[PDB]
Design a protein around this ligand. Structure first.
Ligand SMILES: Cc1c(O)cccc1C(=O)N[C@@H](CSc1ccccc1)[C@H](O)CN1C[C@H]2CCCC[C@H]2C[C@H]1C(=O)NC(C)(C)C
Lengths: 99, 99
């Protein structure tokens, strides 16, 4: 599909077969999800945005479907107010910016 | 153009007759530029991101040419690691997400 930017580009994602609303974010290098108790090993990480750094848990090779398109890769979990789909997964679904 | 996301979507902007690199950021509502002088009145504002809130200066009605496309709108100036072109100006240049 084509998504305009009049509003926040929010789409449904599926992770663990669970559905969430998430922001398609070309300005994020990484995918960052709201606190969730995901199974498996993880590694501590820090990521910086506007305002400073937050601590996140890095989970690798996690399947996640974005607007019906399958993806698998690294997902960071931490205290974000919004689920963020970053470039690592946006490339996997063939997402582009066009003007 | 069509821009893929294997690298950060950085483009050259021209603002106040000066060239800068800025990030095309669909996850940002607002446009936020690194410390710089812009003419005209500004007002103090606060904006929030992943790491928390920052203080910015809000300049309204500011011409910016983004990768050859003209916008005139609100530009926030403050402590950011990267120049960010947000949805307020991405919409003006006809930018969409596509997959
Ligand atoms: C989440 C993330 C990563 O995993 C890796 C790199 C950057 C980011 C990141 O937070 N990037 C942001 C741009 S600000 C930015 C800061 C530093 C470097 C590059 C960009 C997001 O694209 C936009 N970001 C998306 C989103 C992040 C969660 C909080 C709510 C919004 C806040 C919004 C944002 O910050 N908007 C402003 C108007 C304040 C600019």
């Amino acid at each position: 599909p084509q998504i305009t930017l009049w509003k926040r580009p929010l789409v449904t994602i599926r992770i663990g077969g669970q559905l969430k609303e998430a922001l398609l974010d070309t300005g994020a290098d990484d995918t960052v999800l709201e606190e969730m108790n995901l199974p498996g090993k993880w590694k501590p990480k820090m990521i910086g945005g506007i305002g400073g750094f937050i601590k996140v848990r890095q989970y690798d090779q996690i399947p996640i479907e974005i607007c019906g398109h399958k993806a698998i890769g690294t997902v960071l979990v931490g205290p974000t107010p919004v689920n963020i789909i970053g470039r690592n997964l946006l490339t996997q679904i063939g997402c582009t910016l066009n003007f």
